[model samples]
Target: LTYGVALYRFQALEPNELDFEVGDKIRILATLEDGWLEGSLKGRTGIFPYRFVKLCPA
Candidate 1:
């Protein structure tokens, strides 16, 4: 996700979706408006779709 441009994209899950490299950095930029997470990452912004994320540190 970019600092200036707050945008998000939606893509279908692929076969190798979970085959991502390790040690990746995650930057979650979100704010609360009326009790909700208004943020996105990796070019996805506006409405956060949790299913869209394939690989992330737990």
Candidate 2:
């Protein structure tokens, strides 16, 4: 799927479960989930369990 789609899917997770902001800039890393990628911002990191990131879309 496209990056936007992947990002949207990730964002659909529980807000409390996933820590992130709409305009926050995050980094992508390896994840435990197959075909998935991890995400982090500032100092907090979590497994997105999906590929692609939306960045700070305008």
Task: For candidate 1, list the clashing residue pairs, or say none.
Answer: 7-45, 8-43, 8-44, 8-45, 9-44
RMSD after Cα superposition, model 2: 6.5
- Provide the global lDDT of candidate 2 against the true structure: 0.49
How displaced is residue 38 in candidate 2, in Å? 0.5
Per-model TM against the reference: 0.25, 0.44
lDDT, candidates in the order shown: 0.34, 0.49
Question: How would you encode candidate 1's per-residue C-alpha lDDT over 29-53 as one tens digit per residue?
Answer: 5534553233433554443333333
